[PDB]
Structure formats: structure tokens, C-alpha cells
Symmetry: D2
Subunit: 255 residues, 4 copies
């Protein structure tokens, strides 16, 4: 079924995770056709500034994510940054996420694949759509069986990303495809007004799921504040993409 | 508002070709009454990569052929001009004067089109940023144009490749009606060396994206037998596929429409 | 011999052309090894704004350019924008320039070639280096024998141009190559600090000449004010590129 | 200031390969006394496109081989790390710890390198703008790095292609010493599908441009027989050509030097 990966960018506190987790649980009950996966990073290991927020550590993070899964029965997903983190994270994460800058780091991919969990790789901003075939092969070699590739924009000049929707059908040849609606519009080192329009395009073109960072009060978020979707708008967007998908799916090309 | 579908053979290979395509477009205009069809075909391909490529049979022949299409089918007409002097003669038959992408910044060409009183559709140059079309529209308004369209046809992305930045649709909508060019956006500039390439497999998915995001019309080149086309043989849509594509975009437009943002 | 195309961007007045023409004449006498060509546009036909400066017309322009050639004995070059302008412009222009946005307009190229004059085509920001082979072929077909291709940057994301120096050796396979030092650093719809550094790169790589817009008081220029080189700095830069060329030429690759 | 030339085989195919290249680099260091040579070779290619490509013989073997080069020739050493734990063991032999381009934003890796007390050279990511390296240097300084280098190795330009924006040299010079990577800048990422491509014919012209613009050093991978290399066979410079290239860049640097702008 259609996948919806959502949650606050960073684990600012399990308190925050619970609030967002409650709303995602609610939507989960309203849209039984959709498979929801709660997402939040225990560490923002690639911030531009040394003075920016990273998180409260892996242990506190994994603990908070456990609280969400136990309290709401929602599947979990978080990203790893070094090989050693794969095992401990797999304890709670149903889907292990591979950062875009790290999509070519063989040992990280293998470490993730070895856990037995599903692996979602953010397509690097430097990668061409067809270059992801090799990424999937690394994971299959590592024992991975449920593999996802996420479209999150491609480097377009300086401090800008463009979404080449031709990537969706191309990547679909070797993996399930997820569209990252929030990072695709950010301006490296974004514009919220483009989030909805592009997510509509993604489902019209055809994908297997969408990824969206959401926060009760984006303006106060400690990470990606300019692009996180306000929690209150999540239901509306999900219903919208389901209706568009329903009509458009008739025309999705085979493989 | 009425959705615009601009379609026809890339080049006026012959008046016969035009009438064959026109017949089908007329049939579709009778079916899709919520669509305003405009028949398109260039009397001259003034910017081919190679000097040996097909250009056309001249302005005179071209206007005559287009007039026949309008006369026989009652279809609105659009064609592109390449130099200022062509605006006057073309305006006699063209309901919409089209400005080529490479020439979207040539002030006199824009002014020549604007003063004819006809609608003007400017292809956004592959070098232009979305927000920079504001001045293009300003020039047209300054020149007297009352109905203006901006067409998204891709942006230079590395060499011999174009990418469609759909953020351009809501941006350009701020100052003009927006049209999505479904066939030129997937072409590979200078791809085959002496000629440009293209990937037909992406025409349909990208047009679905265009209407989901929201535009005021689509532009599609269509030919009975693309493989035999004298220009853009790699991107022209088979004529038999036109009807299905249009129905599909009207369906996606309808369901997405309630979510189109207000500019 | 090494070509140096220089002059004010636009013909703001023949008065201005004479002042700049006097300095170019002087340098012409100081650097006998270099072939100087005076440049200035009679019309800026592609300004972004309808309210910007275009010029005083073709007649006034061609007249002013005549005054420079007659008074200083300097070769001339200006750009054309429509086919009909080729003939009248050829009366004074030794080199007919084809605008970057118009490098694929067949009739403009043919019209220029028909005049018998040399033709310099600005490589479009949308063109790949190898795509210029076809441009040269159009000119040869039109009777052109002295053909130049000018590097002026390539579209790199929005409102930015990058100079891919790989273009110099590539374009050299079918035409003499000129490097446009002033338009290559401008930001479409620039940065003067990069003019000298990149012109040094151009000669180190290897080219047949350089193109530089110069004005006595750039800040007051009616066109490309942010990138026009101050007249007083022209001599220094020319001497610099000659010294670099002298040493580097030993390593220029054959064809 | 003394010009830096970082050179060596892309990967530590064998200790034998290292000694053969090291011998030549040592010979050149005796000739070009105004140059500070640093021998480079990766103990692991941790980011190959294909799982079937050569990676290396492990950290242990690698450090041992590099130590032999430093021991036999008295040459400074540099190699790249891929995860934080590798900084400590590598620092035992590496005079300069190199940070891979894809990892230029991984805070812990940068910090791990900085605290070793060794110099740190960061390859500018293909996704990074020149002005955004300011924060990269800030992180290193924060972590205790006292000698920092930023290496220009090209920027993503469309798919499977990189372009070198030489404006990056004077920009990055504002906060660190700048190195130009003459061999990676001409490679075509994922060019051959399972592996990356490259155009050797552009290595020399672009390095001439680098020194004309002005940098503090150059980085060049060299191999006795590039065609047999287990990594970057399309871009590694034949070892016999190294001497000529270095003489040429020193000559161009000298004549251009008086014109280098003051940051
Ligand atoms: O095939 P070549 O001659 O490159 O021409 C490209 C065509 O696709 C051309 O007529 C196009 O739309 C013009 O810009
Ligand atoms: O040949 P593939 O495996 O693509 O690897 C690219 C190499 O050029 C690679 O080791 C490179 O410099 C790493 O980024």
C-alpha cells in the first residue's frame, strides 16, 4: 500500500515525538489504505554550522522512538551516519534511512542491509537517476530485500535543488520510490509554498510513497524550520494526494 | 477558466499534413468542449542545429496552409515568428503569435508581436529563471499585448539535457497565463550531433505532473507518423495517442483543481 | 597574432567611443604583437527591462564607429540582431558579431557570412562546446572564411554562469577561440573581482584572443556597469596576459 | 610560500606500487626544492559506484605501506578517512588527513581529524558552493585544526559531469589554503555505468588554469600504467608525465604570481 513517512525532522524531545505521533496515529486510523511510518533523526550529523542543533544522542533518540512505537503501534524509521549505528538502531527502526550525502558509502549500506531491516536510501544531490541501480545492487548483495529510493532534489547551480521527475519512473525499475516533499524544496546553505505543488506532481507521475517532515510549530523547529510542514496541514495534504493518486494511477506506466 | 490545448505538427511539412492533423484536432474539439484548441505549426524552423536540416517552405506557403486549416475546420491558429517583419503578415492568420525560446529577450520581436493586437505566447528561454519572465511580460504589456502566455519548455541542465523545474508554474502564474510544453521539455538539445534528441517515454508522466501542479494549458506537437517527421521526430506524439493524453490530463486537472493555490 | 577585442559595451555617444578609442590606439602602438579590434554595440536589443538603455540607432552607431576607424585606424566590430542589419553594418565592421541568444539563428549567420566580413559568434549559454561545430558549418556554407567562437559562460542554475574551460580546446578544433572576460562573470537578470583571475586562466589554457568591455567610468555606464573594466586598468591586464601567454604557449596542445 | 604538490596512486593496490611511485616523487622532490611534496594513496575506496569494484587491502595494510614510503623516502604522507574511528590510527602516519568530497559535511569525521593535531585537507563536495566552505573551515578550527586545506575537485553540472568553477579558488582562499585536484575534476561520475569515466585530455589545460588563477597547491593521482589501475584508470596521470607537468605549473605560477590578488 501507499507509504507515508512523516514526523519531525529532529528528535528535539520525545515529548515532541509523542505529540506528532498522536496525530500520525489518528491519520493512521483515518486512512487505513495508507501505511504510515514515523520518522525523526536522533542526530543531524551534517549541519552546515558547528553551532547548530544536532540532537540528544543515539540512546535518548532510540528510546524516544521506542516510546512512539509502543504507545501508538506505528512503524519507525530514522537515519544512520556510521556503520556501528545500524545494529542498535535496527532494534526500533523498521526502516533504516541512509543520508543523501552518504548514499555511496558502501559499508554504511552493507551495515544497514545486515540488520535484516528495510532500507531507504536518500538519492544524493550529485547522483543521476540511473546511478541508483548500483546502490540497490549493494543492498541486495548485503542481504536487503525491502529497498526504497527517495527523490530529494538534484544540485542545480549553487544553493538550489531541482526535482527532475523523470527520476521516478527511472528508479522504479529497480526499487520502490519515495518522494521527499520537504527536502526537495530547501535551498542548501527553502520555500514552503512549493511543497504541496510538487507533492501533487509526484503522485500524478507515480511513486510508492511520500516523505514529509512535520512539526506542530515549524517556526520554532531546531532543524529545517523553513521547510517543515505544520502538523495541522498534514491531513489535508494526505487526502489530496490520495484523491490525485486514485485518478492518476490509471495512467502509471508499467515498470 | 477554459483549458488551452495547443497542438499540431512541429513543422508545416505540407498543407496535406496540416489538414490530416487538423481533422483530428477538430474531432477532439467537438468532444472536449471544455477545452479551447489552438492548431500549431511552424512555417519555418529558423534555429535548426544543422544547416542541412529541414526548415520549411517559406512564410507565404505557411500562412496559406494555416489559413486553410482555419478555413476548413474553424480552428484557432498559432505559429512562431523569428524576425520583427514577420509579425504583420503572420498576424493575419495567427490568433496567437509565438515567440521562440532563444528569442524571448529580443525586445523588437516582442514589440512587433504585441502591436498586432493578437495574443502572444512566449517560450521561456532555456537560460531564463522563472522570476525573470516578469520583465518579459512587462515588455509585452508595454507593447500593447492584452492576452499573454508564458510557456515552460525546460531549462539547461548540464550539456545536451533539459530539466523541468515545476516551481516555475506557480511563479510565472503571478504575471501571465502559463502553458506547459510537453514535447520540447523532454528533448535533448544537440543530442544526435547534427540534430537534437529526446525521450518520448517521459512526455506523458511530465504532463501529468504539469496539470497536477496547475497550468492554464498544454502544448504538444503531434504527427501521424513521428518517425517520418522532418523535425523533432524523437519527441512528436503519435496523433492516435492525442485523445487519450488529453482525456487523462483533463481528469487529473479536475481532481487536483480544488488544491491549486491562489496567486 | 593574438587578438584583443575591446571597447565600451554600448555606443553611449561617439564622444565616449573616441575617448576609449584613443586609449586603445595608444595600447595598439605599445603592443605591436597584438591585433586590437574596437568593439561597441549600436543597440542592446536584449535588455531584461523595457525601460533600460538600448542605444541611439544603427545609423548613429555606424557613423560613430566610422569616426573611430577613420580617426585611429582601428579595426571595428559590433553585433547585429536581425538579418537586414548585416549589409549596412559590414560597411564599417571588420568583424560582425553574433549575439549569444542568437547563435542558432541560421538567417542571421548566413546574412553575416554573405557580407564577406569575418564573423565572431558568441557561444549561447545553452550550448555545449561540441554543439558549435554546426555553427561554424553554417557560416562556412554561407561563405565565411574567418570564423571566431567566443566563450562567454554557460547557464549554471539560475542567474549564474560558469566558465567550463574545457570549451577552449574543444572549440579550437573548428574555429579560432576568443574568451569574453567581462560577460563570463556577469549574473544574468556580476562580479568584477573575477574578471582578471579568469582571463589569466583563459590564456594559461590557450585561446586566440580575449574580449573585454572597458569604460572610463564603469559605474556610470548605461549598460553592463557592474562588469565593464575601468579604462585605466586595461594596459596592466593586457601586459599580464601577454606575459602569461608567452610562458604558457609552450604547453598549448596541438589542435 | 612553498607550493604544495600532493601526488600518488589513487589506491594502494600494493606496497610495491607505492614504492615505485614514491621513488619517482622522491627524485622530483630533490629537483623541485621549492615544492613541498606529499605522497597520497587511499587505503580504501569506500565509495565506489559498484560493489564489485576494487576497494583496497584494509586500513592495517594501508598504513603499513604508507609508513614504508615515509620510511624509505622521507616523504610526507596523506590519505583519506571514511569514519571517525579511523582518524586516530591514520594520524600515526598521515601528515595530512584527507576528508572525502561526499563527507565534507559530516561533523564527527571533521572533528575526529582535527583533534589528531594533523593537518586536514577537505575535498569540496560536488554539491557545495564555494562560499559554503567557510563553515567547513569553522568546524575544523573549532575542532583544533591549525593547518587547513580546501580542495577544488569540480561541481555537479548536469548528470555524470563535473565543471570546475575557477571563481572558487579566490573565494575559498578567504578562509583556507586552496588545492586544485587536477585528476578528479575531469572525471565523469558514473560515466561507465558500473564505474566513473574521465577525460585525460583536459587534465593539463585545467591545471594550467588553476595556477594562473592562483592556488596553494595541486593534487594529482599518478600511476606507472593508468590503463591497469584498479581505480580511476581513466584519469590517473602516467608517472612519466609527472615531471613535465610540475615544471610547467611552476613556470606558469611564477609568471602569473605577481598578479595574484590579495585576499
Ligand atoms: O533538431 P535540431 O535541429 O537541433 O532542432 C531542435 C528542434 O528541436 C528545434 O527546431 C527546436 O524546438 C527549436 O528550438
Ligand atoms: O569509479 P567509481 O567506482 O565510480 O568511483 C569513482 C572514483 O573515481 C572514486 O573512488 C572517487 O574519487 C570517489 O569519490
Amino acid at each position: 500500500k501507499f507509504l507515508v513517512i512523516a514526523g519531525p525532522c529532529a528528535i528535539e524531545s520525545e515529548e515532541l515525538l509523542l505529540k506528532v505521533g498522536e496525530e500520525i496515529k489518528r491519520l493512521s486510523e483515518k486512512f487505513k489504505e495508507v501505511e504510515f511510518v514515523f520518522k525523526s533523526s536522533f542526530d543531524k550529523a551534517n549541519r552546515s554550522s558547528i553551532h547548530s542543533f544536532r540532537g540528544h544522542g543515539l540512546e535518548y533518540g532510540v528510546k524516544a522512538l521506542r516510546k512512539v512505537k509502543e504507545e501508538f503501534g506505528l512503524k519507525i524509521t530514522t537515519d544512520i551516519h556510521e556503520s556501528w549505528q545500524a545494529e542498535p538502531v535496527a532494534e526500533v527502526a523498521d526502516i533504516i534511512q541512509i543520508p543523501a550525502f552518504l548514499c555511496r558509502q558502501t559499508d554504511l549500506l552493507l551495515a544497514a542491509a545486515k540488520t535484516g531491516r528495510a532500507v531507504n536510501v536518500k538519492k544524493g544531490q550529485f547522483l543521476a537517476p540511473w546511478d541508483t541501480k548500483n546502490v540497490v545492487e549493494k543492498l541486495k548483495f548485503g542481504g536487503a530485500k525491502e529497498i526504497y529510493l527517495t527523490e530529494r532534489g538534484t544540485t542545480f547551480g549553487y544553493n538550489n535543488l531541482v526535482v527532475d521527475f523523470r527520476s521516478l519512473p527511472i528508479m522504479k525499475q529497480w526499487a520502490k520510490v519515495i518522494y521527499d516533499a520537504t527536502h526537495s524544496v530547501q535551498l542548501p546553505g527553502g520555500m514552503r509554498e512549493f511543497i504541496f505543488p510538487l507533492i501533487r506532481a509526484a503522485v500524478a507521475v507515480g511513486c510508492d510513497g511520500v516523505f514529509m517532515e512535520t512539526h506542530p510549530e515549524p517556526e520554532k523547529a531546531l532543524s529545517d524550520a523553513s521547510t517543515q510542514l505544520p502538523l495541522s496541514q498534514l491531513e489535508g495534504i494526505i487526502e489530496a494526494i490520495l484523491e490525485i493518486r486514485e485518478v492518476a494511477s490509471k495512467y502509471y506506466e508499467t515498470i
